[PDB]
Structures are given as structure tokens and as C-alpha cells.
């Protein structure tokens, strides 16, 4: 998790739990911000795990 | 933390502080008896007793040196001429401090300062 400031009024302090997921015996991380929910942010991180993981294997087959 | 500090700044900054004694001691020998704030006399006596002590042994260079101090020739026309001669026998101890009262302005400790001789 890493957390960052945002936009608000006179008092605002909350920072968002932004997620960063990797495949450790390969290395490549996945941080995705295109949906804001607890495990569902992982459900795009794993979406963009396997998509980027498949983005490896396609050009190899070329 | 004032551990062995032989100085009393008297809430006066430096250049005013040294000249305070410069003007006072000249007036001190002027009338031989004055009255002032009690801590002020408790520091001037560490100056004027050397000022007699340099007048104890006379030199024209000392007279030149005692013009470099206090910048007045009539003062050293008074010193080296009665006091220095008459306090030749006395080695240390030249004024006397006694406590008058308190100042009507804002309760400042008032003391008499005069010499042990005092002209009579």
C-alpha cells in the first residue's frame, strides 16, 4: 500500500490505500488505480498482472 | 553561569559602561565625597584604588598615562599632588563606603562614597 494526498476544502486529511502487487519469482509489479475498492483494486491488478504477463508471451511467439 | 566572573555590567552596554566610570571617578576626585547607587560604588573602588596606585609613584609618563585615562588634566593636576603624596603611606584601601538610604525616585540603594582621608 502507498498513500498520497488529494483535493479538498479547508480541513481535508484522508490519504487513499493505493495497491501495488507483484509476481515475486518473476518480479514485475502491478499498480492500478482505475477502480477504487478493497479487493477489487486487486481484481484489476490481477487483471493487469495476467494481461501484462500475457503481453510478455505474445511478442516471444513472434 | 557566572562561575568566577569578576564583572558587574549594571544593565549597561559596554561603551556606556566604561565611560560611566570615566566620568564618575573624575567627579569623585573633584569633590572627594559623592553619593550614588550602591552597586556602582562597589565597582568603582576597583578602579580608583588603582588610580591612586598609579599616582603613588609619580612619573610624567604616568601623568601622561593618567591623561590617557579620564582625559582631564585638572584631575591629574589634583592627582599626584595631594592624594598620591598623602596616600603614599597607605597601600590598598583608599575610599570608604557607607550606606545612606534609598532613592526617592524608585527605591534605589543610596550610599555615601568618600575617601578614607577626606581632606581633613
Amino acid at each position: 500500500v502507498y498513500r498520497t494526498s488529494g483535493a479538498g476544502g479547508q480541513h481535508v486529511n484522508r490519504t487513499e490505500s493505493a495497491v501495488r502487487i507483484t509476481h515475486i519469482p518473476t518480479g514485475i509489479v502491478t499498480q492500478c488505480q482505475n477502480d477504487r475498492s478493497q479487493h477489487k483494486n486487486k481484481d484489476q491488478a490481477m487483471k493487469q498482472m495476467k494481461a501484462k504477463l500475457y503481453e510478455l508471451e505474445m511478442q516471444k511467439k513472434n | 553561569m557566572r562561575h568566577r566572573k569578576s564583572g558587574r555590567q549594571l544593565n549597561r552596554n559596554s561603551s556606556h559602561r566604561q565611560a560611566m566610570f570615566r566620568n564618575m571617578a573624575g567627579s569623585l576626585v573633584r569633590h572627594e565625597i559623592i553619593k550614588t547607587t550602591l552597586p556602582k560604588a562597589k565597582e568603582l573602588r576597583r578602579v580608583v584604588e588603582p588610580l591612586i596606585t598609579l599616582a603613588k609613584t609619580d612619573s610624567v609618563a604616568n601623568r601622561r598615562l593618567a591623561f590617557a585615562r579620564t582625559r582631564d588634566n585638572e584631575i591629574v593636576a589634583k592627582l599626584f599632588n595631594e592624594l598620591g603624596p598623602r596616600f603614599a603611606s597607605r597601600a590598598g584601601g583608599y575610599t570608604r563606603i557607607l550606606k545612606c538610604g534609598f532613592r526617592a525616585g524608585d527605591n534605589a540603594p543610596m550610599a555615601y562614597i568618600e575617601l578614607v582621608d577626606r581632606s581633613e
Binding site: - | 565625597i33 550606606k99 555615601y112 577626606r118
Partner: protein
């Protein structure tokens, strides 16, 4: 910063009780003119230790 209450008059006096001025309790009579004057001071007319060393 201020009290959120008002301080009572008792603790006022409990604060105030440590504040007596003085008594001198040490009175030095002049040997010559009987001037009950301040110890280690001269008298009002200037005697000290049985002596008119004020030279006034």
C-alpha cells in the same frame, strides 16, 4: 489559554498567602544621638558607629 472555570476566592487567598512584605526586626540605635537607624547604614542625620563620619 484561560481558565475554563473561574478561580475561587479561597485559592486566590491560598495563592496570596505567601506574600507578606517584611518586618525589619533588627534595629540599630545610634550611640550618639539615639537614632534607631538601619543596621550597617548611617543614621538619618548621618551618624555611624558612634561617629559623625557623614562630615555633613
Amino acid at each position: 489559554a484561560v481558565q475554563q472555570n473561574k478561580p475561587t476566592r479561597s485559592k486566590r487567598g491560598m495563592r496570596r498567602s505567601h506574600d507578606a512584605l517584611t518586618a525589619v526586626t533588627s534595629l540599630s540605635v545610634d550611640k550618639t544621638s539615639g537614632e534607631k537607624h538601619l543596621r550597617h547604614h548611617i543614621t538619618a542625620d548621618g551618624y555611624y558607629r558612634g561617629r559623625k563620619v557623614i562630615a555633613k
